[PDB]
């Protein structure tokens, strides 16, 4: 995120880091329950990638993080890689996350919910802070 | 990428308005947000856009695509979760 700021540690407990086998962070995701993570289809996740829950400082070795294996990658069949429409993938975890103060689920909306233009929301992540 | 998790508040746009920036790239299953002095950027992809309603945070967007230079005066584009949640529900149900 450009021109954001550092989060209170553990205050976005659904936020996970998707890392490849070399430990490189390449995308974010959100837990929606102990067994499932929602992310973007264009992240190109494979079952050799890892979901990391409970992390704040990716430079720290003292956090009690959970490195969770991915059993299967459900890319929404409606996803269009040419227009990037319907950009959503579900990850089914091999073993459930253990929910704690720093690891828990985000809510999902009803299909009919209205989130109007002008509403302030929040985005989080470990993306670049300067391009 | 920054070592520590970042956050930013940012407003939702209407699609109509977002099309002033991105034109026909904007589909119904997309929602735009930002153009407010902040921007999602490479490595944020796939994470949450959440809005607080009735005291709880709800996933309204998934970081999807935007300005190649993470321009803070251009809206970012997010997968619109209301358009996708019936699929999520279906998928969890069957697996």
């Amino acid at each position: 995120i450009v021109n954001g700021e550092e989060a209170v540690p553990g205050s976005w407990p659904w936020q996970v880091s998707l890392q490849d086998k070399t430990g490189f962070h390449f995308c974010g995701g959100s837990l929606i329950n102990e067994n499932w993570v929602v992310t973007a289809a264009h992240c190109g996740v494979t079952t050799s990638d890892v979901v990391v829950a409970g992390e704040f400082d990716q430079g720290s070795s003292s956090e009690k993080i959970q490195k969770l294996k991915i059993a299967k990658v459900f890319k929404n069949s409606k996803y269009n890689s040419l227009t990037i429409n319907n950009d959503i993938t579900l990850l089914k975890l091999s073993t459930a996350a253990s929910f704690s103060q720093t690891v828990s689920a985000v809510c999902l909306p009803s299909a009919s919910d209205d989130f109007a233009a002008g509403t302030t929301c929040v985005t989080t992540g470990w993306g670049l802070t300067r391009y | 990428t920054p070592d520590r998790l970042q956050q930013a508040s940012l407003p939702l746009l209407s699609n109509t308005n977002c099309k002033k920036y991105w034109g026909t790239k904007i589909k119904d299953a997309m929602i735009c947000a930002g153009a407010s002095g902040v921007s999602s950027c490479m490595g944020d992809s796939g994470g949450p856009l959440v809005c607080k309603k009735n005291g709880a945070w709800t996933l309204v967007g998934i970081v999807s695509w935007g300005s190649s230079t993470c321009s803070t005066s251009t809206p970012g584009v997010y997968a619109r979760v209301t358009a996708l949640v019936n699929w999520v529900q279906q998928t969890l149900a069957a697996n």
């Binding site: 553990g10 205050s11 929606i32 | -």
Partner: peptide, 10 residues
Amino acid sequence: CGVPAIQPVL
């Protein structure tokens, strides 16, 4: 869902 045990701040 949706309610962090550790409350986010601005």
